[PDB]
Scaffold this motif. Structure first.
Motif, PDB file in Angstrom:
ATOM      1  N   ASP A 185      10.957  -4.847  -5.499  1.00 31.95           N
ATOM      2  CA  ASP A 185       9.911  -4.004  -6.067  1.00 31.95           C
ATOM      3  C   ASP A 185      10.513  -2.910  -6.945  1.00 31.95           C
ATOM      4  OD1 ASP A 185      10.574  -3.053  -3.139  1.00 31.95           O
ATOM      5  OD2 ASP A 185       9.857  -1.264  -4.196  1.00 31.95           O
TER       6      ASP A 185
ATOM      7  N   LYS B  84       7.090 -10.759  -1.293  1.00 35.01           N
ATOM      8  CA  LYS B  84       6.892  -9.361  -1.659  1.00 35.01           C
ATOM      9  C   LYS B  84       8.218  -8.608  -1.669  1.00 35.01           C
ATOM     10  CE  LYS B  84       5.212  -8.269   2.962  1.00 35.01           C
ATOM     11  NZ  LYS B  84       3.765  -7.926   3.049  1.00 35.01           N
TER      12      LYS B  84
ATOM     13  N   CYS C 280       3.763  -3.501   0.586  1.00 35.97           N
ATOM     14  CA  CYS C 280       2.541  -3.616  -0.203  1.00 35.97           C
ATOM     15  C   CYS C 280       1.354  -3.014   0.543  1.00 35.97           C
ATOM     16  CB  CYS C 280       2.259  -5.082  -0.533  1.00 35.97           C
ATOM     17  SG  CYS C 280       0.716  -5.352  -1.436  1.00 35.97           S
TER      18      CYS C 280
END
Length: 128
Positions: free
Chosen positions: A9, A6, A63
């Motif tokens: 971004d 993750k 997230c």
């Protein structure tokens, strides 16, 4: 600390949203995270000569749904002193938004993140 799939971004390719463009010779940064929490709390601040918070920023990182614990601690520090903000207790941030019993710790990071910035500012004038 695992690979944590993750990273990197981007929200439609923003333009430094939640930042004051580099430091200002009096800006403190506070970053906190946890292994089991799998998240990071990054918030910006702006202190003047007197030593009072006049500006407060915040950046997204993690997230999940919109974190209120951050937006709350930010609006609180905005106009508060260094000791005042550092005096804030997670208990206040917990009952403020009534965080879920899932990971109450998510509230402790809110008050712990803001403090990380206050301790960073004093370090900017401590060595110069």
């Amino acid at each position: 600390m695992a690979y944590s799939e993750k990273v990197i971004d981007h929200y439609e390719n923003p333009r430094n949203v939640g930042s004051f463009d580099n430091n200002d010779e009096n800006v403190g940064s506070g970053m906190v995270g946890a292994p089991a929490c799998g998240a990071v709390m990054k918030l910006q601040i702006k202190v003047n000569d007197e030593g009072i918070i006049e500006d407060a920023r915040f950046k997204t990182y993690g997230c999940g749904s919109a974190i209120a614990s951050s937006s709350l601690v930010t609006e609180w520090v905005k106009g508060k002193s260094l000791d005042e903000a550092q005096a804030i207790k997670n208990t206040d941030i917990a009952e403020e938004l009534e965080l879920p019993p899932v990971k109450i710790h998510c509230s402790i990071l809110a008050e712990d993140a803001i403090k990380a910035a206050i301790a960073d500012y004093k370090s900017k004038r401590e060595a110069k």
